Design a protein around this ligand. Structure first.
Ligand SMILES: NC(=O)c1cc(N2CC2)c([N+](=O)[O-])cc1[N+](=O)[O-]
Ligand SMILES: NC(=O)c1cc(N2CC2)c([N+](=O)[O-])cc1[N+](=O)[O-]
Ligand SMILES: [Cl-]
Ligand SMILES: [Cl-]
Lengths: 306, 306
């Protein structure tokens, strides 16, 4: 049946994307009901970014300075406000395409889909994970700020990320939909460096369960281990420590495959110690950590949204 | 800015997906204007599949035997016909959500996005490539037949693939929207094995150009080569032969980076000969071949659709 990095269908989010321009800056906004959400740096000029005082810069702006365009139609802005690092622009029309939705702040290791957009227009969709150092590894060019990340359960879109910037190392940082940055990052041009990019162990294990369900079994072996023994190994390889909560989340996959979680941990431990010796797993030559256990079950069972 | 395997936004296609049931079989259909397209094996029972005579099985079916449901509403079927391996069910209502579209038969090495669906409901979206042996490497469970593959230019959706089956090795086979299978495959349970899965060289090169544009440059070197010399190497590694047409398509990337195509071919040749020695390129430990040169330019320039 196969296993691929899969994004959620994005049509429900495409219908919320709009362009926001303030003065000479144009980026993306998210229109839900009668509010348009966008990064507050829409009010900055490029030289403003080294050390912006957003509250002062915003004093010079009025509702008519924010130009919001939905596809070809212009929205009328009747109010604006700053919430942490996002601006909320109140418009006079509710978006007809607004899906059921929620805003959520995700935890590191959780995955979500990104709908990259430029000037209010979608360009593509891909899957991401909030890394342990709170950056994400995406694909964003200038003008893509304001593109969002989300997850979908049935018919409800949970928005969890809004894109704000690129670090000098090429990774990305952004905020939840309440405007709070994931991690320590700030919306200004300063020295901000990311911390260790540790591997999300529980996802690697889930992906090894997906591999076995799909026929890639060469890495299975005769050993087992314990959580404390496995974790010694994980520390050495900059892997996240595995907890009993993680073992418990892998329980459904453990049950479906008949492979105890600790036995899979023993497989992963040999893989870390000896490498893959030139072989591949689910088409990869390295250990994938951007699938959560929920993702593997979802995809191995065909869940759908409406 | 980063580079990721990215699917096209799928909302324009989500609005075309429907469920089709015939007797005891349920799968997906594609509703464009007033025709619903679906695999003809919707008329088969599981035992029919070993050696189906579709034309005979279809004699026993009338318009009212095909149940088509769009979300929660039922469509009225006023005509049905077989075209190669697809059935076309004429319905009495044009789909309101039909996007501008075209049907195209793609060539091996070209990429497209798949909107996996079950029972007429989207579950996810991912990027694929028509492999040289005409199979695709997807993620499909039972009930996913009828899910389609497509590309989008601006506002026009070009549909290029409809899913029909899984081979015993786990790869997938299907048809264009005219019902002709890609490759030698047939819609019955027989011994069908895929040929060599050769690597699409021109895409690997495009992806090396994307890597350099993104800062991964460790593989660049002091050498050059020729097309005939490079091709000796490609044959040894089961890579597609590179032609002058391929060099020409990489011309725009060659121009933007200042790296002549043959010099990149020399980099790829060392990579094939020596491996990656434990290093990665654009986050991968192997050479990616599912990005076309058009894909790299599109994504490195932020093209959008409306
Ligand atoms: N790549 C960068 O140097 C950069 C760029 C921007 N964008 C505004 C220009 C922002 N930021 O948005 O604050 C911050 C950073 N930074 O490293 O802290
Ligand atoms: N995995 C298979 O053995 C298989 C399954 C199906 N599906 C119908 C059950 C089809 N086919 O659709 O023709 C063909 C094959 N085949 O290998 O040729
Ligand atoms: Cl991917
Ligand atoms: Cl890899």
């Amino acid at each position: 049946s196969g296993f691929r990095k899969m994004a959620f269908p994005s049509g429900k989010v495409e219908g919320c994307m709009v362009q926001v321009t303030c003065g000479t800056t144009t980026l993306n906004g998210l229109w839900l009901d009668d509010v348009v959400y966008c990064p507050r740096h829409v009010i900055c000029t490029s030289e403003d970014m080294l050390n912006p005082n957003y509250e002062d810069l915003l004093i010079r702006k009025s509702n008519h300075n924010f130009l919001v365009q939905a596809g070809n139609v212009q929205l009328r802005v009747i109010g604006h406000s700053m919430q942490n690092c996002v601006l909320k622009l109140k418009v006079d029309t509710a978006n007809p395409k607004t899906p059921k939705y929620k805003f959520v702040r995700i935890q590191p290791g959780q995955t979500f889909s990104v709908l990259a957009c430029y000037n209010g227009s979608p360009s593509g969709v891909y899957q991401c994970a909030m890394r342990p150092n709170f950056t994400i590894k995406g694909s964003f060019l200038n003008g893509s700020c304001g593109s969002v990340g989300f997850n979908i359960d049935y018919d409800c879109v949970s928005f969890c990320y809004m894109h704000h910037m690129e670090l000098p190392t090429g990774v990305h940082a952004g905020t939840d939909l309440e405007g709070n940055f994931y991690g320590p990052f700030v919306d200004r041009q300063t020295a901000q460096a990311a911390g260790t990019d540790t591997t999300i162990t529980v996802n690697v294990l889930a992906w090894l369960y997906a591999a076995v369900i799909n026929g890639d079994r060469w890495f299975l072996n005769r050993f087992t281990t314990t959580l404390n023994d496995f974790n010694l190994v994980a520390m050495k390889y900059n892997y996240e420590p595995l907890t009993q909560d993680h073992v418990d989340i892998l329980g459904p996959l453990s049950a479906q495959t008949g492979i105890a979680v600790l036995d899979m941990c023993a497989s992963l431990k040999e893989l870390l110690q000896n490498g893959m010796n030139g072989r591949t797993i689910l088409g990869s030559a390295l250990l994938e950590d951007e699938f959560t256990p929920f993702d593997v079950v979802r995809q191995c069972s065909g869940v759908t949204f409406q």
